[PDB]
Write a protein that binds this DNA or RNA. Structure first.
Ligand SMILES: O=c1ccn([C@@H]2O[C@H](COP(=O)(O)OP(=O)(O)OP(=O)(O)O)[C@@H](O)[C@H]2O)c(=O)[nH]1
Ligand SMILES: [Mg+2]
Ligand SMILES: [Zn+2]
Ligand SMILES: [Zn+2]
Lengths: 73, 186, 926, 190
RNA sequence: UCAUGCUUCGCGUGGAGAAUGACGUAGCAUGCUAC
RNA sequence: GUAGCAUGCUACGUCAUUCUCCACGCGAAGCA
């Protein structure tokens, strides 16, 4: 149950990005949308994880928006 | 359904009828007692219908209030709930890359751009202190996101180029952190 | 044998080699348009009578120039010589050579025909009309021979596909001039056979791929100057190739040649009536039926179709800025407006509003609606636009900034997913997995999904067969009743739906339905019966869960069009949705035994039943304009007692103005819709069914006509085919006695069940095998040449065991179960669909289960049939839904008692986690 | 309610029946008083039902007249807000060029699609990729629709000013395409 | 921004009809009381 | 025999539920 898991994590991760006003940047939002859609359609889990790394790095690039040290703790 | 004076009257009438039937009294008395019992039962049934309507209305109002309150709560704290859910799911995945980048970003070693997927791609990672530098950067290779990257450049905090040799055990206070390591995927 | 070749070469510089077998006939499969007293049809016959000799030029370099020599009877050889002498002056006649060569014992006559191509025009028409990707050798050879494309072009991934590689269109367009030349030569030939007084029938198979005509067998010589050519089958069979090949593309250049620049058409010019008449008399001179450039003057529906099938072709020559609402400056109280007072339809020609009142005094609510609906003021006052994202003509931008609209990822119901995982779902290798998600899109979602309209190309239908398929379709729709209804009788389900543009800036449809009395609605509807009201139709963006990356856009037609279209079509549409047992199964529920009844109706009494089915790739975006006008014209066949011809034409013009060539509004900017249905007009689901039935009937006609005819053992079907050819290409009036017979034939051997672009057919497998009804290949061919769509094998399905039911209809698979100790067909969905509906939701509020337990009750109602599926995961899906409903009820009761200390435990809520409440939905009692 | 005109008779009958029930009244005649009370109750109940029905009909008629009032109010609001749109875009119609094209028409009718293509004083070009920019909008002045347009401003998908020097083959990847360039007609279609 | 149709479930209000029960008023048959 | 009370049948009015149909409002689900 590790593929349908990354599918749902990508859905929630793109929702979290979208609520951080990432749509205000057309280029970054297009990249995030492409990664999310490719994760949802992915067949092999290796590529899905290597594509989830990029989306999470998009989330982690903006350090002021999300407080990792508190959510993770 | 007790707790009503109408039901008390109905019970009294029923008890009187049950005591009289064994008595076998005059037929006229039995019939008029039956009529009075039926009248009392009709009043009790009317009151029961009223109480059923009132209870149904109260339950409808209570469900409406509960739905309003829970919808307001759901739409209010969406921002916090979404992030908590996201990090719960990322913990659940227990990957090698996601955990690595999250642990690095906790200490402040976040990227400056999207982590690429192709060999001919550039990654720019901000290294906030010498401890994390020694943790990740070893020799002339960078270990970030469960992959090896070739450090092509190390920009000082003031945009000044820094040679990999100048970053040493005692030069650490001298240099102006945070650095920006620009590397290529290997 | 050497002497025979020496004599065939004749008195000419002919250096030719043999193709036969040394003075013997050559066997060859060639397409023939044949109509004898015994056979008829445009089939592919093997006729072995000639002896081709291929010419060599440039010192052994082989070319395509064949000296087709044939042996004749000496009785029709004399006749074919006295007919060629009259016609030998024409430049459109291949040079013959008559010579009697001593072969065995006598001087048997020979008729050599000099320098003919390998294939004829009939071969090209048959190759394109009957297109099968498995044996398209002739089409590839024709394409290669005439430098359309290199021989290695066909090693491409699905080269033929009109969607995967649009470049194939270009490859076809290189035949254009060729075809055009042929047309010109045909006219020349006709003139010749009229000057010499020669009565004959022109067929495609007597014209090589240079235009030259070479057969004069059935030409009788009448008094000079009054010979009549017969060119019905010729022009009709050739029509779909004139636009597929873009033949008249050379009419856009000065002096009509591709080596000169485009003619600079005047911008203010909108009336091209004289140009249309010139083109008609230039290419279709000897077409008998009268052609009205403006279909305002057309007599009936069968004349509107005929005269618009020509306008679709002639409108590709004129500039695209001339097609649109004609705009005139009117004064209202002294303030000059700029309002639309006409229209220039690519198909219907120029239409002028009848009661245009310039110099008015005051604007009533109806007139304000009319003036604020049309794009005259909007496009006139907006600033020019050149949108390079799309290919569609862009009119103007209504704002100083482009509006980009995105699509949100879609929320995740983590509670249901966790529950399902705890119940063993979503494992590795499990047969049930997540396939349906909410896909997100960038800022160009709407414009891209709109630009998908590039698949709508101008299609010139074969008019002689369309005018028969229309009668058979109307026969299919003869069990209903329709007409115009007053504004009192119009039923509007939901009035909280948008009123399109610009009317959504001030309210919903409720505001515009309650703010103008029934008198105003009747006045507007009576206005549209003699005026054309253009409208802007916003291109919305649907938000739904699917398995494809396709952000579907739907047309938000204005309220002005919707009100009038409702009044016009509501009675017929409500009658189509209240009839049980018809081919169109719109309005029939799948519950309470509806699915079983529908299936048992489709099966009917077909003798050797096989099932087949299809689903058009882009039904709305690929549909040609002719078929949509046809659908609108057969939906209006019910107004024979309430609307006159003028009223019906102006209603057709209004429909074409606002749902066929509308000016869409895709994000703060006006574009021009190329064509095809606007999914969102008042008849979208019922105009797709007519188009579906039209395609099916066309497939049957082509399947029956392309059959040999000599090989049909059944003497009734042979006469049916002969009479069908007579009714198509030898009659101009409708023969109801045979329309009824062909309809009965189709009903007996080809049972349909239609719902929009989704059809299920139970057909006689023996006939389909022999070629007497439409197989799936025939339907694919018809789609290729009449939709500009190649229907891949993903959209098609076939089932040779009808006890398994349709493989897929309306996204619902069918299975035969044991219901109530009886065997019935039940529809079950895709389990991924139900699971993904549970896991992912639209609104964030829906992610709290206790709020919405009716979501899961409805999803369990839809997922109940899976309980009987032999696979166990599919039944586990339904049990999971019931268990989750129980969990939600428990949690709701707990929360309610925890917050408001009032126990809430009813006995009527325990039936939503019991299977009986859901079994009752599929048992045929209610 | 107890305000009905005939409620007095029912009340008096009830009082008489109550007096006859106890205090030493007749046993067989008290049935007559009970019957009188019963008939009075039936009459009063029917009158009350009729009055309640009339009151509910009056309430319904007070929900239909108010709804008509709101319908007319909304009609007036939409009429004003719909003829205030027409006049706004009626003032934006530059009468010089529009009249020039209209009066050159054969009979006053001209296709709509040329009204902006020959009279509009501003052009918006949406450019998806840099090849399209180079082909169409390159430079500061370009030619379109047989007119000369001078570029006034270039913005990206984020609506941020993009200088003409920032649109290059090397710097193309750093821009948020499509770019929206709003040119202005030069010297009235020169 | 979210169109046109069809179908189904949940709850609420209104009208009509049917079933059982209750009370009352009226009509016909028998019994008892005032005259 | 008039009037009143008791028993047996028919008609009308008012309430108490159960069910059927429709007219509408509200929430939700599927399908083209
Ligand atoms: O939400 C919808 C879906 C469909 N429709 C109407 O039904 C038609 C067919 O709707 P389909 O769902 O069958 O899709 P499609 O054939 O357009 O495209 P593919 O999925 O095959 O690629 C549409 O083109 C439109 O006419 C709607 O009006 N609304
Ligand atoms: Mg489809
Ligand atoms: Zn005509
Ligand atoms: Zn009509």
């Amino acid at each position: 149950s590790k593929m349908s898991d990354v599918k749902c994590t990508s859905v929630v991760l793109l929702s979290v990005l979208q609520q951080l006003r990432v749509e205000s940047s057309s280029k970054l939002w297009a990249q995030c949308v492409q990664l999310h859609n490719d994760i949802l359609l992915a067949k092999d889990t290796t590529e899905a994880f290597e594509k989830m790394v990029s989306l999470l790095s998009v989330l982690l690039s903006m350090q002021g928006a999300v407080d990792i040290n508190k959510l993770c703790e | 359904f007790s707790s009503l004076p109408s039901y008390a009257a109905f019970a009294t009438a029923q008890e009187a009828y049950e005591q009289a039937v064994a008595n076998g009294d005059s037929e006229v008395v039995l019939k008029k007692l039956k009529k009075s019992l039926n009248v009392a039962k009709s009043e009790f049934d009317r009151d029961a219908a009223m109480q059923r309507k009132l209870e149904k209305m109260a339950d409808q109002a209570m469900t409406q209030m509960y739905k309003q309150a829970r919808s307001e709560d759901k739409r209010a704290k969406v921002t916090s709930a979404m992030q908590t859910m996201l990090f719960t799911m990322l913990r659940k995945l227990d990957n090698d890359a996601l955990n690595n980048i999250i642990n690095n970003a906790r200490d402040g070693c976040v990227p400056l751009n999207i982590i690429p997927l192709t060999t001919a791609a550039k990654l720019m990672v901000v290294i906030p202190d010498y401890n994390t530098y020694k943790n990740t950067c070893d020799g002339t290779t960078f270990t970030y996101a469960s992959a090896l990257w070739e450090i092509q450049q190390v920009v000082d905090a003031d945009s000044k180029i820094v040679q990999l040799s100048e970053i040493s055990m005692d030069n650490s206070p001298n240099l102006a952190w945070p650095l920006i390591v620009t590397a290529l995927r290997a | 044998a050497q002497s025979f070749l020496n004599r065939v070469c004749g008195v000419s510089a002919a250096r030719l080699t043999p193709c036969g077998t040394g003075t013997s006939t050559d066997v060859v499969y060639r397409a023939f348009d044949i109509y004898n007293d015994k056979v008829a049809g445009f089939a592919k016959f093997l006729k072995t009578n000639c002896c081709r000799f291929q010419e060599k030029d440039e010192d052994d370099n082989l070319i395509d120039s064949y000296f087709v020599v044939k042996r004749h009877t000496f009785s029709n050889y004399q006749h074919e010589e006295t007919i060629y002498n009259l016609l030998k002056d024409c430049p459109a006649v291949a040079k013959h050579d008559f010579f009697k060569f001593r072969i065995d014992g006598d001087m048997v006559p020979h008729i050599s025909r000099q320098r003919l191509t390998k294939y004829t025009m009939a071969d090209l028409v048959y190759a394109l009309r009957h297109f099968d990707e498995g044996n398209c050798d002739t089409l590839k050879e024709i394409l290669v021979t005439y430098n359309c494309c290199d021989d290695d072009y066909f090693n491409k991934k699905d080269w033929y596909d009109f969607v995967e590689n649009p470049d194939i269109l270009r490859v076809y367009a290189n035949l254009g001039e060729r075809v055009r030349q042929a047309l010109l030569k045909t006219v020349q030939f006709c003139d010749a056979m009229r000057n010499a007084g020669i009565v004959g029938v022109l067929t495609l198979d007597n014209q090589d791929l240079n235009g030259n005509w070479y057969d004069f067998g059935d030409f009788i010589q009448t008094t000079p100057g009054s010979g009549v050519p017969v060119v019905d089958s010729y022009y009709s069979l050739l029509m779909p190739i004139l636009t597929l090949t873009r033949a008249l593309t050379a009419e856009s250049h000065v002096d009509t040649d591709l080596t000169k620049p485009y003619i600079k058409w005047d911008l203010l010019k909108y009336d091209f009536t004289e140009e249309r008449l010139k083109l008609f008399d230039r290419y279709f001179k000897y077409w008998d039926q009268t052609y009205h450039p403006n279909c305002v003057n057309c007599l009936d529906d069968r004349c509107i179709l005929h005269c618009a099938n020509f306008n679709v072709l002639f409108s590709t020559v004129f500039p695209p800025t001339s097609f649109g609402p004609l705009v005139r400056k009117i004064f209202v109280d002294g303030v000059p407006f700029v309002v639309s007072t006409g229209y220039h339809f690519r198909e219907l020609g120029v239409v002028h509003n009848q009661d245009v009142n310039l110099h008015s005094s005051r604007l009533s609510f109806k007139e304000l609606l009319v003036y604020a609906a049309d794009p005259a003021m909007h496009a006139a006052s907006g600033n020019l636009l050149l949108d390079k994202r799309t290919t569609c003509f862009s009119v103007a931008a209504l704002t100083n900034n482009v509006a980009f609209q995105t699509v949100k990822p879609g929320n995740f119901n983590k509670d249901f997913y966790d529950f399902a995982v705890s119940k063993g779902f979503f494992k590795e290798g499990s047969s049930v997995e997540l396939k349906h998600f909410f896909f997100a899109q960038d800022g160009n979602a709407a414009i891209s999904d709109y630009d998908y309209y590039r698949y709508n190309l101008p299609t010139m239908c074969d008019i002689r067969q369309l005018l028969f398929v229309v009668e058979v379709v109307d026969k299919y729709f003869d069990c209903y009743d329709g007409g115009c209804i007053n504004a009192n009788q119009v039923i509007v389900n939901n009035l909280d739906k948008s009123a399109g543009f610009p009317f959504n800036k001030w309210g919903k449809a409720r505001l515009y339905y309650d703010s103008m009395s029934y008198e105003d609605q009747d006045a507007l509807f009576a206005y549209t019966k003699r005026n054309v009201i253009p409208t802007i139709t916003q291109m919305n963006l649907k938000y739904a869960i699917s398995a494809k990356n396709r952000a579907r856009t739907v047309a938000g037609v204005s309220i002005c069009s919707t009100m009038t279209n409702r009044q016009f079509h509501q009675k017929l549409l409500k009658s189509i949705a209240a009839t049980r047992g018809a081919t169109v199964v719109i309005g029939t529920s799948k519950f309470y035994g509806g699915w079983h009844n529908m299936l048992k109706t489709v099966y009917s009494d077909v003798e050797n039943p096989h099932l087949m089915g299809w689903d058009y790739p882009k039904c709305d975006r690929a549909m040609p304009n002719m078929l949509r006008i046809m659908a609108s014209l057969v939906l209006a066949r019910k107004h024979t007692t309430c609307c006159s011809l003028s009223h019906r034409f102006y209603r057709l013009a209004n429909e074409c103005a606002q749902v066929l060539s509308e000016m869409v509004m895709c994000g703060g900017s006006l574009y021009v819709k190329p064509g095809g249905t606007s999914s969102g007009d008042a008849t979208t689901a019922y105009a797709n069914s007519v188009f579906n039935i039209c395609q099916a009937v066309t497939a049957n006609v082509n399947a029956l006509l392309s059959t040999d005819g000599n090989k049909i053992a059944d003497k009734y079907v042979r006469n049916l085919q002969h009479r069908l050819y007579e009714c198509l290409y030898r009659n101009r009036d409708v023969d109801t006695d045979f329309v009824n017979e062909f309809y009965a034939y189709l009903r007996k051997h080809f049972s349909m069940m239609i719902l929009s672009d989704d059809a299920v057919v139970c057909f006689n497998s023996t006939y389909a095998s022999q070629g007497l009804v439409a197989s799936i290949k025939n339907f694919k061919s018809v789609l290729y040449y009449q939709n500009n769509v190649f229907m891949s094998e993903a959209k098609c399905w076939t089932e040779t065991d009808l006890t398994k039911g349709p493989h897929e209809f309306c996204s619902q698979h069918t299975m035969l179960v044991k219901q109530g100790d009886d065997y019935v067909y039940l529809p079950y969905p895709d389990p991924s669909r139900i699971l993904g509906a549970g896991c992912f939701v639209d609104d964030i509020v829906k992610t709290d289960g206790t709020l919405m337990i009716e979501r899961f009750v409805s999803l369990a109602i839809d997922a109940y049939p899976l309980t009987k599926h032999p696979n166990q995961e599919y039944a586990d899906v339904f049990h999971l839904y019931l268990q989750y409903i129980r969990k939600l009820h428990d949690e709701l009761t707990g929360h309610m008692l925890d917050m408001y200390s009032v126990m809430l435990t009813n006995d009527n809520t325990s039936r939503y986690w019991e299977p009986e409440f859901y079994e009752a939905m599929y048992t045929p009692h209610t």
